Design a protein around this ligand. Sequence first.
Ligand SMILES: O=P(O)(O)O[C@@H]1[C@H](O)[C@H](O)[C@@H](OP(=O)(O)O)[C@H](OP(=O)(O)O)[C@H]1O
Ligand SMILES: O=P(O)(O)O[C@@H]1[C@H](O)[C@H](O)[C@@H](OP(=O)(O)O)[C@H](OP(=O)(O)O)[C@H]1O
Ligand SMILES: O=P(O)(O)O[C@@H]1[C@H](O)[C@H](O)[C@@H](OP(=O)(O)O)[C@H](OP(=O)(O)O)[C@H]1O
Ligand SMILES: O=P(O)(O)O[C@@H]1[C@H](O)[C@H](O)[C@@H](OP(=O)(O)O)[C@H](OP(=O)(O)O)[C@H]1O
Ligand code: NA
Ligand code: NA
Ligand code: NA
Lengths: 361, 361, 365, 367
Amino acid sequence: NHVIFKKISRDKSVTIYLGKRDYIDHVERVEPVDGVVLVDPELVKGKRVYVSLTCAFRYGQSFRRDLYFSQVQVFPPVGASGATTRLQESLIKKLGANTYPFLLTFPDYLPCSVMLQPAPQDVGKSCGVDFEIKAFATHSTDVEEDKIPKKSSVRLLIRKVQHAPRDMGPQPRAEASWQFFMSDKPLRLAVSLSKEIYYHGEPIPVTVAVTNSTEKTVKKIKVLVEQVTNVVLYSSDYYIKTVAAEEAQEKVPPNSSLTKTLTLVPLLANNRERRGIALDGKIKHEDTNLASSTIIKEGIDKTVMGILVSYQIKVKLTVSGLLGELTSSEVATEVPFRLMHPQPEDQDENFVFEEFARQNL
Amino acid sequence: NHVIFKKISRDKSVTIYLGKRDYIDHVERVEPVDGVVLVDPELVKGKRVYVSLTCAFRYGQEDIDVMGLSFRRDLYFSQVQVFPPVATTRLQESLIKKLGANTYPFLLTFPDYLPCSVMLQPAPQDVGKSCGVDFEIKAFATHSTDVEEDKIPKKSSVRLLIRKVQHAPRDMGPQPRAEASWQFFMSDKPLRLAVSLSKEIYYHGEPIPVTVAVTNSTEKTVKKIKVLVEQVTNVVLYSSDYYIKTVAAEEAQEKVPPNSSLTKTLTLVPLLANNRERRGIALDGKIKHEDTNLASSTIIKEGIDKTVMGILVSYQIKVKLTVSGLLLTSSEVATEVPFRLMHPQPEDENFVFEEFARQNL
Amino acid sequence: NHVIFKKISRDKSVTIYLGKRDYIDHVERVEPVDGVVLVDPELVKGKRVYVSLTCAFRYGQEDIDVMGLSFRRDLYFSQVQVFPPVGASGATTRLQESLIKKLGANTYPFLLTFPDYLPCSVMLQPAPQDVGKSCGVDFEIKAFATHSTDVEEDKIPKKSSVRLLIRKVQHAPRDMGPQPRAEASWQFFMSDKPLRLAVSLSKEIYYHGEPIPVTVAVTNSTEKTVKKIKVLVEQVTNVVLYSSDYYIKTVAAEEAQEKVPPNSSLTKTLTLVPLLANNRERRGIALDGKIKHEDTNLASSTIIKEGIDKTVMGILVSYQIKVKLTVSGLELTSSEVATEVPFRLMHPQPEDENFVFEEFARQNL
Amino acid sequence: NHVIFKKISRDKSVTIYLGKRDYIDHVERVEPVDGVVLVDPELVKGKRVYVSLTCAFRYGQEVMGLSFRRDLYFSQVQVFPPVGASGATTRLQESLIKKLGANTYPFLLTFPDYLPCSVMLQPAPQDVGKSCGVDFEIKAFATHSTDVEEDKIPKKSSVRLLIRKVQHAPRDMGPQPRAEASWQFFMSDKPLRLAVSLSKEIYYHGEPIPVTVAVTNSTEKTVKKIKVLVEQVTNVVLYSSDYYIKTVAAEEAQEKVPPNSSLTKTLTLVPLLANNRERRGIALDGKIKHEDTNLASSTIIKEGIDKTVMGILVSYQIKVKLTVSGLLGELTSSEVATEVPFRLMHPQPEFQDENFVFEEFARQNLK
Ligand SMILES: O=P(O)(O)O[C@@H]1[C@H](O)[C@H](O)[C@@H](OP(=O)(O)O)[C@H](OP(=O)(O)O)[C@H]1O
Ligand SMILES: O=P(O)(O)O[C@@H]1[C@H](O)[C@H](O)[C@@H](OP(=O)(O)O)[C@H](OP(=O)(O)O)[C@H]1O
Ligand SMILES: O=P(O)(O)O[C@@H]1[C@H](O)[C@H](O)[C@@H](OP(=O)(O)O)[C@H](OP(=O)(O)O)[C@H]1O
Ligand SMILES: O=P(O)(O)O[C@@H]1[C@H](O)[C@H](O)[C@@H](OP(=O)(O)O)[C@H](OP(=O)(O)O)[C@H]1O
Ligand code: NA
Ligand code: NA
Ligand code: NA
C-alpha cells in the first residue's frame, strides 16, 4: 500500500510524482531521486520539461551557496523513455501515456538536511541546507529567447536523511582526573557508552565511574547530550545546546567509588524551545527531528557541508567546598558519539496519492 | 598612549579591563593583576560579581577513535568580590575616573611557588600528549541560589588567558662564563674539547657567542664541528614525557688534523622563528599566536618540589665533532654546556581600548 | 639437622655454602649472610677469591622482533676477600666454625651484612593485558676467583665464579604494640537517604596464609536494595624506577548473594586468605620470586623507613580489602558503590650441629 | 663445465654420481638429491640396488657402537633392477645417463621441511660434553638372496657419501636488530646508556657486520674500553643438555668515552672459522680437518616443529661490553654488556648438454 507524493503546477500543465519525501544517505552511497512527471499534452505542445535537483546553503531570512546542481529532460521524451526503476514502470502503467520518468542521482560530497532558526538568546541568523526537486516547462514565442514561467513549474523540498553505515567507530570511552588547589588526592571520572552510533530515539546508556580519593563530597552527577553546531560558510556561528539531561540521585562521599549507568534519549520533543538547535527541517513540520551527526568524507573540505552538527555526552560533577573557595571552573568531561537514523533495510504495488506538503502541528 | 585590554561577557552584564596581557615574574616577586570590572546595574541587581586568578596544569588533547584522556591540577586559586566593593593603584582610580561609576576594582597577587607560562603541542614523531600551565583571570556574576547549589552562569562571566613571563632579577651579581672541557682519548692520545659561553643567563633574541677549542693530539682528523642550542622539556605531572629539540644550529665543517689545535667562536640565537615546526617545542603560549615565544628556563626556588612546576624547560649548547682516520666509517663525539634563557630584567591618564584577543600569525 | 645449600663453579675450583636460601628482614634489623667458600688450592694457584652481595632493580624482557630494552640500578654492593684469608669478615659465627671442621682447612668464612635502606625480594612478569614489562629486585651472592691481570682487563672468568639468587623476606618486627582494629565507615546518600557501609578487620597486619576476617555492616535507610556484596583482597603494585607502571589485582575474592532492602541492616563476616595458590594466572602480580619456583609467594607489603625516598624500593607493594555493594534502581540497571581498607601482609615475627647438604637450585612446579 | 662427484664400491659393482656435495635449504623448500648409479651388469646379476638418504643426530663418537644415535629422516628408492620407465626426472640425470652409458640408473631422494642443516661440534679441553653432530648420508648399496631365506647387504657392494644440508637465506628478513641498555651504578644518580643497532637481521658467512654503538655517558666514570663480540650459542637438545657460548669475532674500539659525553661509532666484524685458531668447541657445518667447513648457520625452527628434533640449536648475537673505570671490584662484580640477536647463513639462491668433469667425492683437507 505505497504512498506516492504528488504536486501540480498552478497552470496544471506539469504534475510531479515522488516515491518518498526523504532520500536515504547511508555513507557508502545515496539513494537516487526516481520519480515521474505527468504532462497535459495540450498545455506542453511545443514546450520542453526538465527536472532539476539543487542543493544550496542559505543564511538570513542575504547569502546563498549552491553545493550541487543537476538537470534532466522528461519532455519531449529522451531516447527509449523507458523507466530504470520498478516504481517508475508501475507509476507509468497506473497514470497513463503522458507519464515520463526522471532519475536524479546524489554525489557523495554533500551534507544531509540541516537547518537552524536562532533563539532570542542567540546571535547569528537563520541558515540551512535545502534540497529542491523542481519540474518546469520552457517555451519560445520569439527566436531571441526561451521563457520559464513559474505557473508551469512545481518544486518539492525533499530531505537528504543520514542513515547508519555498515561499520561503527570504537566504543566511546573517556578518563578525566582532577587535583584541586591544596588537594594531594585526585578526583577521577571514567565515562563509557555501549557503542559509537545511536539511532534517533534510541536510549543512550552513559556508564559513569567516579573514584573520589579526596576529602570532599561529589554532591551531584549530571549527564547531558550536548548538540554542537558550527556554521562553516559565510558566518562562523557557534551553538552548543543541551537536548537531554539526567541528574543522578547519588552522592559520592570522601574516599569512595561509585559506578552508575544513566540513560538519556535526545529528542526534539524533549525541547519546548526548538530554536537555537540544528534540525533536519522547519520547526512547524511534524516530521522534523534533531539534525543527524555530520559525516565529512575523506578529501572533502568541511566548508562545503555548510553547517557542521556533532553530539557529545557531558558529565558534570558538583564538588562540596569547591565552587567559591578552591575553583571558579566546572568539573566536567565530554565523550563524542554520532546520532543518525537506522541502517537501511536490505508484480506491481498498490498506490495511494497524497499532497507532498508536510503535515504541521 | 596606554593600551587597555577589554573583554565583555555573553549577556553583557559584566565587562573586564586589564592593564597588561603579560605579567612579569622577576624571581624576587611577580607583578600583580590589577584591573576593573564594568557592570550593568540592572542585569546585576541582587547579584555579587567576583574575579578569580587560577593557575592550572592540564594534560591531554582530542583524538577521534582514541580514548579521551585528561588530567588537570590547580597549582593556585584565589578569588575577590568586585561588586559591591570592600589599597588601590593609579591605573585602577584612573580607569574608574575615565569609564564611569559602574567600574569597580580588583587586585589578584601571585605567590612565589608557581611556574611561568609553559605549554607544548606534540609533533607526529612525539609519543606524549598536549600539556601546559594556563593562567586564567575570570570575572563572573552569581545569585543567592547559586551558593544554595553550585551553578555559576556561563553568560554572566568573562575569562582572560594571561601569560606569566620569566624575566631576569633586577640586581644580579657578575656572571661567570658557562664552560666545560673534555679529553676524548683515541689510541691513548687526547682530543681535548673546550666549550665556553660569554655568560650563564642569555635573553630571548640575544646572540649567544659559543667559543669551541679543539686540541687534536690524535692520529685522527676532526672533519666536522656542529653547534646546537637544544631545548630539553621534562613533563613532571601525570606523564614523564621527554622532548629534546634543536631550536638553533650552525654546521662549520672546519677540519682539525693531527697535532693541530683550532679555536672558533660561533653565534646562535635560539628563536621560535628559526623553525617552521612549532610542535614538539616548549612555548610560553599557543602555536597560532604571534606574541608566542620559546618557553624560558624553569627557575626552581629552593624548598619547592620541581613537580609543582608541571613542565621543566632547560637549554644547553650541544657540540658534535665528526672524527675519522680508520680508512672510512667516522665516529661522532658530543658534549653539552647548560645555560639559562629568559626575558631581560625590568627597571624603575590616556587610554586606547584594544580587545584582549591575541593577534594570529 | 640443619640443611646447608651448596653450588659449585663450571671449572669446579670454587664452591659456596649458605645457611639459608632466604634472609629475614624484620624492619629493626636484617639477618646478615654468613657462609663459607670451599676452594682446592690446586685449581686457584696464586689467585684471590672474593664474595660480593648485590641488590639490583632490573626492568625489561626478551621479545622476538621487538627492540631489546633493559634498565639496571644497583641499590647495594659490598665485597670481601675470602682467599687468601685476612680479617675480612671480622669474627667468625657459630655456623662458620662448625662448617670449617666438616670440610677441612680448604674452607674459608665470609660475612656480608644488609643495610636498612633496601627493599625485600619483589618481582613481576606482565599478563597479556598489562602495558609494562618484566621487572624485579634481585639479591645476588657471588663467589669468584681472579688473577692480578683479571681485574685490570674487566675479565673475571665466568668459569671460576658461582652466583646464588637469595631472597630478602619481610617478617614482622619482634617489638609490636598490640594492634588496633583496621576499620572505617561511609554514608552513600541516595535521594538524601543514607546507605551506611562500615568495614572492619580484626587487626592491621596479617601473615601470608593467615585468614583475614572482614566484617561488613550495611545500614540501608534508602528506598533501594543491596542486591550483591563483593569482598576482595587487592594487591596494588607501583613500579617507581625507570617506568611508572600500575597493577591492581584480585588475589582473593568472596561474592555473597545477600539482599539488604529498605529500613533494614545486615552485618556479615567473610574470611579471605590472599595466596598465590588461589591464582591460576601467576603473572600480573608482585611475587617474592620467579613464577616457576614452588617456594615463591605473593610479595609482602613494602615497608618504607623514615627519611627513605620510596623510589629506592624499586617496586611498591600494598594490600587493601575492597568491598563492592551492587544497588537496585527505582529498575532498568543497578549502581555499584565501593570502599577500601588498607592492611599490611608480611611473614610472622622471627624466633656444634649435624649438617645435611643440598643444591641451591629452587624446586620448580 | 659442471664438476660431478663420484664414488665406487670396494667390489667395483656400484658407482654413485652427485651434481654437488652440498644441498641448499632456503626455508621455503630444500633442493632434492638427484643423481645416478652406474652398475657393473655382471656384478649385480640377481641383485637389487637401492639408494637411501638418512639424517641422524649422534653423540659420543664422530667403532663398537658406544655412542647415542637418533634418526631424524630415512628414505630409500630402488635403481636396479630398473623401476618402471627408469627415465630421468632432471636434466642432470638425462645428461649423466647419456655420458655414462646404458648401465646408468637415476635416483631422486627428497628432503622434508622439518630437518636441521649440517651442524657438528668436537669439544675443546675446557668443555665438558662429547663430540656430537647431525649427519646426512647418501648410501647406494646392493642386496642379494641366499638359499636359507636370508638377504645380505655386503659393505663391499655399498658407497656412502656424507653430504651437507647448507642453510641459504629465505626471500624475507626480520626487522633491523636494535637494543637499548642503561645502568645506574651503586651511589650514582646518573645513567650510563648504550644503544646498539645492526644494518640488518640476516648476514652471510664472509659478510662484514657493521655494529653501530651509541654510548651516552652521563656518569662521572670513564668508559675506558668498548668491546664488540660475535658470540655463537649452541644448545644440544637431544641426549645431553650441553651449552656452549664462544667468541667467533672480536673488535676493541680505540676510543674511550669520558665522563658527561656521548660517542657514536660503527665497528665492523666478520664471524669466520678462518679467523679462529681453535676450531674445537664451536658449531661447524662439517669436520675440522675439511677445507670447505664453515661456522654452522643459525638454526631456523619451523612453526609447530619441536626444537628437540633439530638435535643442535645454533644462534648468533652481537655482545657490546663496556669497561667502566673503578667499577669492577668497587661498585660491581658483574659485566656491563647488552646482546643483539641476528642470523648467519649463506646467500639467497635464484638447450645443449653440460660438459662433465668427474672428481672423488672425498672433501679436500687443510694442508
Ligand atoms: O509555492 P512554492 O514556490 O512552491 O513554495 C512553497 C512555499 O515555500 C511553502 O512555504 C513550502 O511549504 P512549507 O512552508 O510547509 O515548507 C513549499 O514546500 P514543499 O514543496 O515541500 O511543499 C514550497 O514549495
Ligand atoms: O569563549 P571563552 O570561554 O572565552 O574561551 C575561549 C576559547 O578557549 C578559545 O579557544 C581561546 O582562543 P584564543 O586563545 O585563540 O584567543 C580564547 O582565548 P583568550 O581568552 O586568550 O581570548 C578563550 O577565551
Ligand atoms: O648458571 P648461572 O650463571 O649461575 O645462572 C643461573 C641461571 O640463570 C638459572 O636460570 C638460574 O635458575 P632459575 O632459572 O631457576 O632462577 C640460577 O639461579 P638460582 O640461584 O635460583 O639457581 C642462576 O644461578
Ligand atoms: O668407508 P666408508 O664407510 O665409506 O666411510 C668413509 C670414511 O669414514 C672416510 O674417513 C670419510 O671421509 P673423511 O675422513 O674425509 O670424513 C668418508 O666420507 P665421504 O665419503 O662422505 O667423504 C666416509 O664415507
Ligand atoms: Na531544483
Ligand atoms: Na580564574
Ligand atoms: Na658455540
